[PDB]
Each structure stands twice: as structure tokens, then as C-alpha cells.
Amino acid sequence: VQIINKKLDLSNVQSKCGSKDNIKHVPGGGSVQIVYKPVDLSKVTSKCGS
Amino acid sequence: VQIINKKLDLSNVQSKCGSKDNIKHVPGGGSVQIVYKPVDLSKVTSKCGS
Amino acid sequence: VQIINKKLDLSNVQSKCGSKDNIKHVPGGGSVQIVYKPVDLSKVTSKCGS
């Protein structure tokens, strides 16, 4: 079992104006289990110039 | 088993204007378990010029 | 088992104007368990020039 993720960003100018993230990279060799059951009322709000 | 993540980011100018993150990188060789059940009212708010 | 995460950032100018993070890198050889169940009312707020 070979799993590969490759990502590039190349920029003159790059911007992100507000972001939110719950579970990011979770690699597991033998096994992975996720039990995602929040009472979620989370908000992301932004006003931007770019 | 062989799990690979590669990420390159290149910029002349780069800006992040507010961010929030709950669980980041969680590599487990034998096993991983995640039991994600918050009561979540989290906010991200931002005002920017870039 | 082989787990790899590789990340590069290269920048002339780089800025982050406000950020928040609960659980960062959690590497485990045999097993990893995360039981994320907070009553979370966290705010990330920022006002910025960049």
C-alpha cells in the first residue's frame, strides 16, 4: 500500500482572509477511525482588501 | 505501507488574515482514533487590507 | 510502515495577522487516540494592515 499526496503553491502575491479547520491531515498506517459528531454553531466572517 | 504528504509553498508576498484550527497533523503508524464531539460556538472574524 | 510529512514555505515577505490552534502535531508509533469534546466559545479576531 503506497499513498501519496503532492501539493504545490507558487505565487507573486497570495492571500487568505478568514479560514477555519476541524480535522487536518490524519494518516494512519494500519487503521484510521473518525467519529465526528459535534453540536456545531461555528462561524467564519471576514471583510477584505487584496 | 507507505504514506506520503508533500507540500511546497512559494511566494513573493504572502498574508493570512485570521485563522483557527482544532486538530492538526496526527500521524499514527499502527492506528489512529479521533472522537470529535465538541459543543462548538467558535468564531473567526477579520478585517484587513493586504 | 513508513509515514512522511514534508512541508516547505519560501517567501520574500510573509505575515499572519491572528491565528489559533488547539492540538498540533501528535505523532504515535503504536497507537494514537484523540477525544476532543470541549464546550468551545473561542474567538479569533484581527484588524490588520499588511
Say whether residue A30 is in contact with chain C using an 8 A CB cutoff: yes
Distance between first and last Cα of chain C: 43
- Reading across the β-sheet that carries C2-16, which strands appear in turn? A2-17, B2-17, C2-16
Residue A2 neighbours by CB under 8 Å, 6+ apart: B2, B4
C43-49 sheet: strands from edge to edge: A43-49, B43-49, C43-49
What type of residue is C8?
L
Contact C18, B17 (CB under 8 A): yes
| C8 close contact with A: CB closer than 8 A | no
**A30: which DSSP letter?**
S
> Which segments of chain A are extended strands (E)?
2-17, 20-23, 31-36, 39-40, 43-49
Tally A–B CB contacts below 8 A.
194
The grid cell for B43 is 468564531
**Mutation site, A2, A36, A42, A43, interface B, largest B CB count within 10 A:** A42
- Cell 499502527 belongs to which residue? B30
- Resolution of the experimental model, in Å, one decimal: 3.0
